[PDB]
Nucleic acid binder design. Structure first.
Ligand SMILES: [Zn+2]
Ligand SMILES: [Zn+2]
Ligand SMILES: [Zn+2]
Length: 89
DNA sequence: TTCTCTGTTTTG
DNA sequence: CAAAACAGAGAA
């Protein structure tokens, strides 16, 4: 059940197909590029590029819906943290 | 505190 | 199913 053979990893995964995608963690290729002009950042994961672009645009797309909370967040993990701490949503 | 990562879940 | 997103971890 999908064990990574690489030395000092040995993680096990929910699926074989992820086990293969996971291998990009053990290579130094960074195939994704930031589209913002001049920025040299590169990525391995598409979500990482997505969140990163918000650093350029300044957006805060995560908007707490709890009545009268009004807080907003740039990064998904920070919105998750707020939910977990407050019980909002 | 801001932000990148990544294993898993959700969406289409 | 593949793509998009989430949730939590945690580097800096
Ligand atoms: Zn591995
Ligand atoms: Zn960039
Ligand atoms: Zn809230």
């Amino acid at each position: 059940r999908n064990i990574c053979p690489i030395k000092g990893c040995g993680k096990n995964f929910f699926s074989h197909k992820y086990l293969v995608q996971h291998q990009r963690v053990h290579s130094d290729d960074r195939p994704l590029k930031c589209p913002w002009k001049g920025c040299k950042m590169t990525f391995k994961w598409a979500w990482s590029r997505t969140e990163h672009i918000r650093v350029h645009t300044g957006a805060r797309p995560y908007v707490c819906a709890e009545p009268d909370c009004g807080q907003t967040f740039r990064f998904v993990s920070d919105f998750s943290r707020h939910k977990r701490k407050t019980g909002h949503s």
